Amino acid sequence: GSSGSSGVRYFIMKSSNLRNLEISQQKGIWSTTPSNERKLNRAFWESSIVYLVFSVQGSGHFQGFSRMSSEIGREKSQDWGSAGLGGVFKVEWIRKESLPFQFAHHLLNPWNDNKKVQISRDGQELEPQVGEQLLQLWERL
Numbered sequence: 001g002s003s004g005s006s007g008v009r010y011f012i013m014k015s016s017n018l019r020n021l022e023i024s025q026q027k028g029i030w031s032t033t034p035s036n037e038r039k040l041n042r043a044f045w046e047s048s049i050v051y052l053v054f055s056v057q058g059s060g061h062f063q064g065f066s067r068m069s070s071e072i073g074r075e076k077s078q079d080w081g082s083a084g085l086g087g088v089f090k091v092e093w094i095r096k097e098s099l100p101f102q103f104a105h106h107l108l109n110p111w112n113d114n115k116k117v118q119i120s121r122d123g124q125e126l127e128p129q130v131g132e133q134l135l136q137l138w139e140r141l
Contacts, residue, residue, distance in 0.1 A: 008049040010131035011040065012109075014122040015056045016082050021063055023079045024054075025096055028069070034086035036123035037072040044068045051131065052091060055118075061098040062118075065135060066091035095138035103137045
């Protein structure tokens with residue numbers, strides 16, 4: 001058997017406007033800054049699953065989460081309102097509702113700074129121990 005075996009990585013994605021994410025939740029695709037794509041491509045080829053948690057800047061909420069469904073630069077799209085973005089990839093959405101930051105206030109991010117999960121950057125890594133508890137919170141809505 002494999003020395004690495006089955007396993008999943010967790011990441012916080014960020015948006016400049018909820019309108020850019022409306023395309024993502026309808027078309028089933030996403031796009032990030034070119035400097036993140038190498039971490040997500042590596043994670044996608046190594047892992048069983050790559051979890052991508054969504055957050056619009058200034059919203060006070062996590063907009064949902066998806067699983068990475070294809071590799072970056074294999075897919076393309078002209079649909080974006082923001083133009084500072086890189087290439088495109090497919091995403092498989094699991095939950096799509098705006099979860100308040102208050103729900104995850106008992107959770108932290110030791111892979112950032114041991115800060116509260118809301119205090120995470122565009123492409124910031126998340127521990128699986130805090131992240132597996134974050135994803136269950138959509139079931140409380």
